[PDB]
Design a protein around this nucleic acid. Structure first.
Ligand SMILES: [Zn+2]
Lengths: 140, 66, 100, 56, 185, 70, 55, 61, 143, 141
RNA sequence: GUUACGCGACCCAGCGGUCGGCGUAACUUCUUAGAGGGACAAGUGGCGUUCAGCCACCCGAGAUUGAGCAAUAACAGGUCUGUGAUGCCCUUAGAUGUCCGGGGCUGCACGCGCGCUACACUGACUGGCUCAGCGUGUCCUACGCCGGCAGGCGCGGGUAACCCGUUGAACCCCAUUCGUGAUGGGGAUCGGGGAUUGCAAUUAUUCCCCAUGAACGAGGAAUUCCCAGUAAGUGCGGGUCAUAAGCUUGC
């Protein structure tokens, strides 16, 4: 069999996508890709498909399992974990030029799709309520 | 704010005078040399000393160094 | 030949992994199969204190901390064999518990 | 039985109180420290000093 | 090809201003499917200059900290305000948004050098994003204690500023900051 | 202090079936302003002209609903 | 007092029941993990217990 | 009278609080004459300024 | 959705004159002793469809609504739901509405003052009752 | 062809299932359905006159995903934000007598059974009709 | 933990679709945590005494992450109410020792400081849908019955990557009702009832229900904090805790 499973993550939302050989199946936690909430962020999950075309997703089945984070973090985790899975599938089996043809499209559009943003929550300090904010000081 | 302190500049000059025959213009090569001839206590220091030796290798190659 | 599990809990990693790797190799010349040391996550104890004994000051705080490292190594052998490997001198920070 | 987050704590409270009594008791004969060897066999405590004959 | 909200093309969008065309980013390189990009813009200077101008707008709708991180709420405001601009005028709202920034850009300000002020010129990045400041706060206070909704008021604020009319809050504040600037040259 | 109609009288129901379907924009925020009617009529009134098919639904959301001429 | 009211007040909870195990203080006790030390006497012995100050 | 000018050099930041900066621009009528003006907001080299009142020459604030 | 001819702009179901323009679950809260929680279960026990405003109810329907709220034990409304529960004179479970709510407040406040309870002395002194701090708040109307 | 519950919209699926649970009128609706706040973090009665059918529909839908959910697992699903006037808000649980009478009325319809471990799991009869009601939602579009 | 496989449900025929249904074959990608690795201003181009260095760009996870530690000299800074750290003084049996009972530390013409909740439609309400992370536990809690609710009664589990717990958190998201009116915004004040903790609830301990429905329509002069996962919104732990967060400390 020809399968691969990569990850792609936002803050604490880790998403792993299993990429077998199959027929055009993209679903997340058992649910179809078009029915993932929030539906305001519908096109951010479809930026893998709308850029490259469905025909580059034709020979595979994609099954994304997602854990952690929040609603908006998990949308950016899925679209990264899809876009890194098709690159690993067109590398371990298909030619390096076929990888480079879609590596060029996914860097021209939204570098976040392949390189994870390293920003995490800066810790809270005892001066104030947040990381940087301080409690209000009074003189007289 | 990448100014190198005296403990990096003094240690790098004594290395080149003792081991000029081994050093080149590759950082990663001289990174492996600088841990071979020296008891450097930390890795982040080791990259700074090796990073200043390789900078000096170009100045030595063009002319003399004070 | 049955289940026998040894838990290794210490406060430092360096003394713990020295005791740890001493027990893997001890069952290797015994030709006793041993599943490698699984690593339980670190428990971290986080007392936070006001740092001045009076109450006057600019409200600094003192974050004490102590992390506990835990290791489990299991063998498959009767009690005739295992306790001899345990009987060696064990480093003073590391705690040993043998499960029957 | 006891919780192991409590067990490491109470062992620290053990040798802290132990080190504080031997500081007060052996203040006059160069006492320095206590090393603790809690074992399931006999627990040995080694008292470090420079006047052994006054510890004895 | 990349249509915003799946509906609005960026192909025919043209900037009829020489100055504000390096600094208004809606073309095919800057074409996105949603105005929720989650990009790192505020870590280097002038990197908001290549930020897409439709989602600098949705970032500025999150003010008055009652609704401060609710960016998904502000996308569906900008979504519905684009439907209304099409129903009222009949063209691509991305064209109307471009004309609402050009006509509302204060091209003369006045710094302080006790009271007397010197007329200075405005950089082409400042007069873009000060216009974004004016368009949103014109939409916000015109929608506050009114039954007229925020996506309705954001639409009409962009319609009136694209026409150059003196109805909207953005144009008359753009005109006030220039009249004060002219009287202390 | 403005008082609105909670129910249509005869002379404003006429404007509803005549003036309202000729608008480029039909939303309960605009319709309730031009007819001086309370905002819960303007939802019920525009769900009534939609059932006749005299207007065209272009979007629908829990925040607002947008119609147009037909 | 005599045997029936000299210590008769019930002390099974509250601050009257819990004292520092070192200096017999009643305030600022750290009850966490059975320490039962007042917070001043705690940070005196915090390294002898073995709490390493990392942050 | 329309005037469009192109920034060719940044000449440091001027002001009490340093709130603005001085530039050296070339007009787009002819690329020969150059005036110094003091613009506020972030400015790069090469971006276009529009000028209401030309010929003012911007003495130091 | 057109206005009826019998559309009552006002309704006097008690000594309170209530709006006819409000929806019926919220018009009858103008009556004292009826809040929004109580106003729904009276309208569920009368089976008025709550989408109707307070003007379009006929006189026979309003007569039924005022019957049910004045007799709550009879129409399957529980004892934990009422206003005066286990009354300090009769032991009754009743829902005082308009002036019976106003008359039994003073009857509860004069009873506390008559026996000179500490909760009754502070109603007479105009102070707070429920043990709040009075050093820094409630300074309105005290100068 | 073959459609499961997860293959279709969820917000329409409770609207299809609650019409089904009321149609086959065998569901045991208790007496106090007209006077409950439905949780002590709410403040009014639920606006739907028959909320029991749409609460029993969603409760039946949750057991298709995570079985072994007892009553204490059902107060967590229908928990929400309690506003405390001038004090800050907190999480608060749903009503236990609602979730108990819902699962017991789903027990008396033979959609659910009790489990060897805790909670109540669906029946194969319960897994049957949910996929069929989902087959009619996919039919509608 | 994953994948594979074996059964099992269900759907409509496939070495199909879903399953946190069940069991075991390879495996560490995801989880954990060890060892090493990695970034040095190294490379390129500028600028610079051609030094020290600086700017920009390539490549890259990263081209200043955030803390902790922190000198000499001080200050009549605070703490004798942390100490069986302590000099001197005072008291020492009708006690300034100590216990017990009751009260007070909450008292309200008023002034100020840190906060909380708000002034609503970018909202509230009622449903529906769907996502955390630190961390704690002999007290934490699963499940079953009872009650409308707070709660109660049974059975179990966890001294804890084992159980609670896949911590089904809020905001958000979708659908409802409302309609610019101190309104269904706001929830102060206060009446009546119901539970729980405790030796004791009155000066309401908290908790719940029903009623009551105040100022407040963005705040004068002033002034605080802050530049990136930051401000702000938003909820959740820990500390204090028999009962317990409008606080603080962390997530
Ligand atoms: Zn102490």
């Amino acid at each position: 069999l020809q399968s691969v499973q990569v990850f792609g993550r936002k803050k604490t939302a880790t998403a792993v996508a299993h990429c077998k050989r199959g027929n055009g199946l993209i679903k997340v936690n058992g649910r179809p890709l078009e029915m993932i909430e929030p539906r305001t962020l519908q096109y951010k999950l479809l930026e893998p498909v709308l850029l490259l075309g469905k025909e580059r997703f034709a020979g595979v089945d994609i099954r994304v399992r997602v854990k952690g984070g929040g609603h908006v973090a998990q949308i950016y985790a899925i679209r990264q974990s899809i876009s890194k899975a098709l690159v690993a599938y067109y590398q371990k089996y298909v030619d390096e030029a076929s990888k480079k043809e879609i590596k060029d499209i996914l860097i021209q559009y939204d570098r976040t799709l392949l390189v994870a943003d390293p920003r995490r929550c800066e810790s809270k300090k005892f001066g104030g309520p947040g990381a940087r904010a301080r409690y209000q000081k009074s003189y007289r | 704010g990448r100014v190198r302190t005296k403990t990096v500049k003094k240690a790098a000059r004594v290395i080149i005078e003792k081991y000029y025959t081994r050093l080149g213009n590759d950082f990663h090569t001289n990174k492996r040399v600088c841990e071979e001839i020296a008891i450097i206590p930390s890795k982040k220091l080791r990259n700074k000393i090796a990073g200043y030796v390789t900078h000096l290798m170009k100045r030595i190659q063009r002319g003399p160094v004070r | 030949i049955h289940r026998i599990r040894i838990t290794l809990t210490s406060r430092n990693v360096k003394s713990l992994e020295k005791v740890c790797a001493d027990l893997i190799r001890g069952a290797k010349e015994k030709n006793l199969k041993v599943k490698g040391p699984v690593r339980m996550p670190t428990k971290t104890l986080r007392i936070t204190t006001r740092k001045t004994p009076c109450g006057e000051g600019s409200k600094t705080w003192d974050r004490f901390q102590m992390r506990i490292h835990k290791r489990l190594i299991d063998l498959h052998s009767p009690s005739e064999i295992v306790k001899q490997i345990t009987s060696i001198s064990i480093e003073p920070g590391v705690e040993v518990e043998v499960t029957i | 039985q006891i919780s192991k987050k409590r067990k490491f704590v109470a062992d620290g409270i053990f040798k802290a109180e132990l080190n504080e009594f031997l500081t007060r008791e052996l203040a006059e004969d160069g006492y320095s420290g206590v090393e603790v060897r809690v074992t399931p066999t006999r627990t040995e405590i080694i008292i470090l000093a420079t006047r052994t004959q006054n510890v004895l | 090809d990349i249509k915003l909200f799946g509906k609005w093309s960026t192909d025919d969008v043209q900037i009829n201003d020489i100055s504000l065309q390096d600094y208004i980013a809606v073309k095919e390189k800057y074409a996105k499917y949603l105005p929720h990009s989650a990009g790192r813009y505020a870590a280097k200077r002038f990197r908001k200059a290549q930020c897409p101008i439709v989602e600098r707008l949705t970032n500025s709708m999150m003010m008055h900290g009652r609704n401060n991180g609710k960016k998904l709420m502000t996308v569906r405001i900008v979504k519905h305000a684009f439907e209304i601009i099409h129903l009222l005028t009949g063209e691509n709202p991305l064209q109307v948004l471009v004309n609402a920034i050009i006509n509302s850009g204060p091209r003369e300000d006045s710094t302080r050098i006790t009271v007397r002020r010197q007329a200075v010129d405005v950089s082409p990045l400042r007069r873009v994003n000060q216009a974004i400041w004016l368009l949103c706060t014109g939409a916000r206070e015109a929608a506050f204690r009114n039954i007229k909704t925020i996506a309705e008021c954001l639409a009409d604020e962009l319609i009136n500023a694209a026409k150059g009319s003196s109805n909207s809050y953005a144009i008359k504040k753009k005109d006030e900051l220039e009249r004060v600037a002219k009287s202390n040259r | 202090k403005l008082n609105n109609l909670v129910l249509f009288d005869k002379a404003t129901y006429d404007k509803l079936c005549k003036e309202v379907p000729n608008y480029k924009l039909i939303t309960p925020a605009v319709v309730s302003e031009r007819l001086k009617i309370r905002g819960s009529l303007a939802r019920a009134a525009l769900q009534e002209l939609l059932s006749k098919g005299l207007i065209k639904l272009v979007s629908k959301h829990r925040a607002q609903v947008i119609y147009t001429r037909n | 007092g005599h045997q029936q009211l000299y210590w008769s007040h019930p002390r099974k909870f509250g601050q009257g029941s819990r004292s520092c195990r070192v200096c017999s203080n009643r305030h600022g006790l750290i009850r966490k993990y059975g320490l039962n030390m007042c917070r001043q006497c705690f940070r005196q012995y915090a390294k002898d217990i073995g709490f390493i100050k990392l942050d | 009278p329309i005037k469009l000018a192109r920034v060719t050099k940044v000449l440091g930041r001027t002001g009490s609080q340093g709130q603005c900066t001085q530039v050296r621009v070339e007009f787009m009528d002819d690329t020969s004459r150059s005036i110094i003006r003091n613009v506020k907001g972030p400015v790069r080299e090469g971006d276009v300024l529009t000028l209401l009142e030309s010929e003012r020459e911007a003495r130091r604030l | 959705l057109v206005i009826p001819e019998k559309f009552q702009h006002i309704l006097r179901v008690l000594n309170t004159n209530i709006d006819g323009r409000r929806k019926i679950a919220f018009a009858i809260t103008a009556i004292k002793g009826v809040g929004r929680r109580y106003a729904h279960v009276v309208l569920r026990k009368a089976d008025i469809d709550l989408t109707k405003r307070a003007g379009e109810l006929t006189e026979d329907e309003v007569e039924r609504v005022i019957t049910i709220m004045q007799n709550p034990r009879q129409y399957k409304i529980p004892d934990w739901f009422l206003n005066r529960q286990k009354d300090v004179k009769d032991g009754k479970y009743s829902q005082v509405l308009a002036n019976g709510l106003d008359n039994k407040l003073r009857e509860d406040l004069e009873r506390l003052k008559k026996i000179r309870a500490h909760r009754g002395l502070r109603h007479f002194w105009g102070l707070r009752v429920r043990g709040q701090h009075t050093k820094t708040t409630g300074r309105r109307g005290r100068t | 062809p073959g459609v499961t519950v997860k293959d279709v919209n969820q917000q329409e699926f409770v609207r299809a299932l609650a019409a089904f649970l009321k149609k086959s009128g065998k569901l045991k609706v208790p007496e106090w359905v007209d006077t409950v706040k439905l949780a002590k973090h709410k403040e009014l009665a639920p606006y739907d006159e028959n909320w029991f059918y749409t609460r029993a529909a969603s409760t039946a839908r949750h057991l298709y995903l995570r079985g072994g959910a007892g009553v204490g697992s059902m107060t967590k699903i229908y928990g929400g934000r309690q506003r405390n006037g001038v004090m800050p808000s907190h999480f608060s649980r749903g009503s236990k007598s609602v979730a108990r009478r819902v699962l017991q009325a789903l027990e008396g319809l033979k959609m659910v059974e009790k489990d060897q471990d805790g909670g109540r799991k669906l029946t194969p009869q319960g897994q049957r009709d949910l996929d069929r009601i989902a087959g009619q939602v996919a039919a509608a579009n």
